[PDB]
Amino acid sequence: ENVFIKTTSLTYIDGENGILRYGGYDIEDLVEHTSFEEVVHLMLYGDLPTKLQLQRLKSALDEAYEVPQQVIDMIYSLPRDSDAVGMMETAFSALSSIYGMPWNKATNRDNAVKLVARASTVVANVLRAKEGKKPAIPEPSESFAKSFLKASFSRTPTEEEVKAMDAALILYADHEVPASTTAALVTSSTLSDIYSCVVAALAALKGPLHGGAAEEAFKQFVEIGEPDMTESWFKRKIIEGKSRLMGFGHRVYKTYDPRAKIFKKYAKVISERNSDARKYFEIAQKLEELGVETFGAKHIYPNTDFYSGVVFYALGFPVYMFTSLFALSRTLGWTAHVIEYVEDQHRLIRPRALYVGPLKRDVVPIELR
Amino acid sequence: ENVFIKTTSLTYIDGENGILRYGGYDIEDLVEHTSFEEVVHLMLYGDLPTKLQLQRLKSALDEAYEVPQQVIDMIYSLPRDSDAVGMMETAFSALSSIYGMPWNKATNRDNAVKLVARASTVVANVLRAKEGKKPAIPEPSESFAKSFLKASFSRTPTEEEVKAMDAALILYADHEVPASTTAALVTSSTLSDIYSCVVAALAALKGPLHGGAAEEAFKQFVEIGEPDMTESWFKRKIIEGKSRLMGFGHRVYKTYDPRAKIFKKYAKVISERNSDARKYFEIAQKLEELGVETFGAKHIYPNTDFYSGVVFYALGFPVYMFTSLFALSRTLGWTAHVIEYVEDQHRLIRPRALYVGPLKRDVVPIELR
Ligand SMILES: CC(=O)SCCNC(=O)CCNC(=O)[C@H](O)C(C)(C)COP(=O)(O)OP(=O)(O)OC[C@H]1O[C@@H](n2cnc3c(N)ncnc32)[C@H](O)[C@@H]1OP(=O)(O)O
Numbered sequence: 001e002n003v004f005i006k007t008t009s010l011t012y013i014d015g016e017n018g019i020l021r022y023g024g025y026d027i028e029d030l031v032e033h034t035s036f037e038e039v040v041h042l043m044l045y046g047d048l049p050t051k052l053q054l055q056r057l058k059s060a061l062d063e064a065y066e067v068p069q070q071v072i073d074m075i076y077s078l079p080r081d082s083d084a085v086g087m088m089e090t091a092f093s094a095l096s097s098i099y100g101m102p103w104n105k106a107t108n109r110d111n112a113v114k115l116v117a118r119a120s121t122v123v124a125n126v127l128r129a130k131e132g133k134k135p136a137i138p139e140p141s142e143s144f145a146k147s148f149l150k151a152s153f154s155r156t157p158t159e160e161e162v163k164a165m166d167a168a169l170i171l172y173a174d175h176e177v178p179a180s181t182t183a184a185l186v187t188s189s190t191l192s193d194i195y196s197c198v199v200a201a202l203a204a205l206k207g208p209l210h211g212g213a214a215e216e217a218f219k220q221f222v223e224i225g226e227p228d229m230t231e232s233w234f235k236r237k238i239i240e241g242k243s244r245l246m247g248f249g250h251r252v253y254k255t256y257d258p259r260a261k262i263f264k265k266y267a268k269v270i271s272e273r274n275s276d277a278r279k280y281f282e283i284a285q286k287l288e289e290l291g292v293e294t295f296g297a298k299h300i301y302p303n304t305d306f307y308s309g310v311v312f313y314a315l316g317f318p319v320y321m322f323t324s325l326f327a328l329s330r331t332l333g334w335t336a337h338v339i340e341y342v343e344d345q346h347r348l349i350r351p352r353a354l355y356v357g358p359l360k361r362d363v364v365p366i367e368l369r
Numbered sequence: 370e371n372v373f374i375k376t377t378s379l380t381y382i383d384g385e386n387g388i389l390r391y392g393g394y395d396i397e398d399l400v401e402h403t404s405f406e407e408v409v410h411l412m413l414y415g416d417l418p419t420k421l422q423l424q425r426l427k428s429a430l431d432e433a434y435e436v437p438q439q440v441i442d443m444i445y446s447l448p449r450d451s452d453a454v455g456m457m458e459t460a461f462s463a464l465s466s467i468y469g470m471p472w473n474k475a476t477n478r479d480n481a482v483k484l485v486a487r488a489s490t491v492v493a494n495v496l497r498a499k500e501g502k503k504p505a506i507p508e509p510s511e512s513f514a515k516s517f518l519k520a521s522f523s524r525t526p527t528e529e530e531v532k533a534m535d536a537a538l539i540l541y542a543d544h545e546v547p548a549s550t551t552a553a554l555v556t557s558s559t560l561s562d563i564y565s566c567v568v569a570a571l572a573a574l575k576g577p578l579h580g581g582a583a584e585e586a587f588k589q590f591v592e593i594g595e596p597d598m599t600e601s602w603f604k605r606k607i608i609e610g611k612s613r614l615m616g617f618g619h620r621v622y623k624t625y626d627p628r629a630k631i632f633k634k635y636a637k638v639i640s641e642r643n644s645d646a647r648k649y650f651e652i653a654q655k656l657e658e659l660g661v662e663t664f665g666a667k668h669i670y671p672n673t674d675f676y677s678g679v680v681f682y683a684l685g686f687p688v689y690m691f692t693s694l695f696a697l698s699r700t701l702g703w704t705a706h707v708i709e710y711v712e713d714q715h716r717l718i719r720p721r722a723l724y725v726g727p728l729k730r731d732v733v734p735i736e737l738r
């Protein structure tokens with residue numbers, strides 16, 4: 001009910017003007033001129049890092065990728081058709097049991113850095129389990145994005161692929177206070193460890209009113225199948241059937257979502273080099289044109305979910321991974337919000353329930369019921 | 370901030386008068402004259418069951434105890450010194466991935482019944498893992514309490530032991546809206562499956578501002594060691610050191626907590642038959658006398674956590690299990706609250722964060738930082 005649950009210095013949103021900033025820096029500026037590691041430092045420490053700061057952060061990520069074999073075994077023992085976010089939830093519960101530490105001002109940010117690394121290991125292994133491939137642990141490389149793509153796919157990505165993944169990680173890092181962030185905050189109020197805060201976030205993200213938006217948008221393209229079929233699909237499903245166009249519209253943004261233009265940019269480059277990926281990009285682009293022509297006068301435009309799937313697909317990720325890829329990115333926003341909350345504004349969360357149930361009554365023996 | 374998050378028909382509390390009712394039935398009446406299975410039916414369906422209702426409920430519990438071997442393997446692959454609530458969290462995430470189903474009015478309560486059974490299987494196996502014993506799955510018996518104790522300990526409990534466990538399960542089933550229930554509710558708002566609602570609850574319960582109260586109260590008795598040492602401990606720690614007496618005091622109850630008198634009753638019976646358990650019961654009883662003599666005029670009295678540990682210890686549970694035993698019971702209240710919430714009063718949870726961070730600034734190249 002518009003209820004402000006906390007203050008933040010992390011993320012500024014201007015819905016009327018289409019502006020998204022992390023720590024005062026415009027999202028476009030961050031994507032073009034920084035890197036996910038730099039944005040991790042910005043969200044956790046409040047500024048972009050110096051060379052030496054960046055170096056220490058990178059070494060901390062590198063040493064954190066390795067998790068115990070038992071975590072990997074658990075991922076690989078779930079049914080291969082299980083929801084990927086659910087597999088992440090299970091892996092993060094195990095990480096919580098192994099690594100969880102108490103809240104401590106001096107080490108909270110170091111603990112979050114290690115968790116973000118381990119999110120990379122988990123997501124790469126969730127993909128590989130579902131695909132029936134052998135496990136792989138991310139290894140040091142020139143960047144977090146590159147290490148994640150190499151672990152995921154066992155081939156060296158191109159620079160354009162790396163840059164697209166890096167962008168996606170920045171783009172999805174934080175936004176508003178959705179149910180997943182709220183669950184993390186509630187969990188943090190009892191001083192549950194940071195890994196368990198992420199477990200709760202993932203539990204909420206698994207729900208189909210929160211998770212699955214990138215999948216639902218991209219599934220439109222899959223159903224269309226070929227670019228020359230787009231107009232007909234749009235005539236039948238949208239114009240005649242009055243379905244909403246998935247990946248259009250936003251509760252805050254009354255303009256294009258600033259993230260959507262950036263996902264689009266990166267989709268174009270990497271989609272062209274595979275004809276399947278190219279086909280989906282061409283279908284999305286035609287739907288975007290039809291959608292803005294039809295709904296732009298109502299202040300309904302592409303949102304961040306419209307082109308993110310196109311990027312992930314072009315990278316080699318199946319559709320079943322898209323919300324998990326969101327989660328990979330959003331671990332930064334979850335951890336940064338809970339650290340802000342615990343360090344500044346820790347109230348123990350204790351709401352009430354109004355009793356509207358039966359008045360006093362006496363137990364009757366079962367034979368008399 | 371006294372903020373009513375929902376209505377409920379489950380649990381009525383009168384703090385001034387020391388009254389606790391489930392569905393209009395006084396807690397004392399339920400413990401004496403019903404059973405945990407009957408209270409499961411009351412919380413989920415709104416009344417105590419008929420014979421035929423009870424029978425169908427019991428068969429549904431019996432068929433639900435068995436879980437896949439992979440869930441058991443996961444419990445047994447965590448470090449044996451891991452927090453027991455964390456092990457539960459991991460097992461419930463795996464159960465969510467295997468069994469999680471969408472919300473459906475016709476089947477929500479059946480899904481909750483099966484989850485409560487599986488909570489029995491999980492908690493029994495968490496104990497057994499930590500103790501380095503072979504797994505055991507609960508099997509049908511005369512009651513849920515008995516099946517749980519037999520799986521836990523591989524011996525047939527006495528009737529008095531059964532009745533104490535049954536009481537404990539009823540006593541802890543629901544109370545107020547603590548952080549664990551709040552996390553469950555947030556998770557349910559996205560329509561995440563009931564098992565993931567419990568995962569979030571357990572994530573919050575792991576935090577030391579919510580979990581661990583029965584352990585902290587009972588650890589006082591352990592430190593005292595022998596009944597003839599109680600007065601000295603109380604003189605030193607409480608009178609001179611001004612520590613609070615753990616398991617005394619309550620934010621709502623300004624009288625004895627109605628649950629505390631019932632835990633006491635059941636502790637007396639089963640404690641006498643082992644001299645270690647008897648010693649702790651005698652120490653607790655002497656502390657209670659000292660505590661009420663010292664703090665009763667301030668409306669500070671024993672709470673539900675004071676004697677629950679004594680019951681659990683007398684049953685054979687180590688101290689490390691006490692919050693997990695709470696959780697076993699409270700799965701009923703968690704599932705019943707989320708079902709009420711989703712079916713009646715489902716609002717998608719979307720609070721806001723007020724931005725107080727930096728104004729607009731431009732990215733500077735790393736060399737200039
Ligand atoms: C987690 C999941 O998987 S679910 C995610 C999948 N969903 C999507 O991809 C669609 C996302 N977008 C939306 O649902 C919405 O646009 C929200 C919910 C973001 C905004 O919806 P509203 O609150 O109705 O927005 P608003 O009040 O601006 O609507 C104005 C008009 O635009 C229409 N509209 C809103 N969104 C859309 C859309 N995506 N497509 C077509 N029309 C739309 C409304 O029906 C309304 O029409 P009217 O003139 O006949 O009244």
Ligand SMILES: CC(=O)SCCNC(=O)CCNC(=O)[C@H](O)C(C)(C)COP(=O)(O)OP(=O)(O)OC[C@H]1O[C@@H](n2cnc3c(N)ncnc32)[C@H](O)[C@@H]1OP(=O)(O)O
Nearest residue numbers: 577578579580581582585613614615616617618619620667
């Ligand atoms: C999850 C965990 O493991 S933490 C759980 C472990 N904690 C416990 O077992 C203790 C539980 N009880 C308490 O902490 C408290 O009694 C609450 C928090 C339940 C109530 O505390 P308050 O809000 O201070 O209650 P209240 O305002 O009634 O206090 C009145 C007086 O009684 C005192 N008091 C309150 N609880 C206790 C206690 N348990 N022992 C001794 N004195 C107490 C207060 O200090 C106050 O003293 P004063 O006259 O010098 O001001």
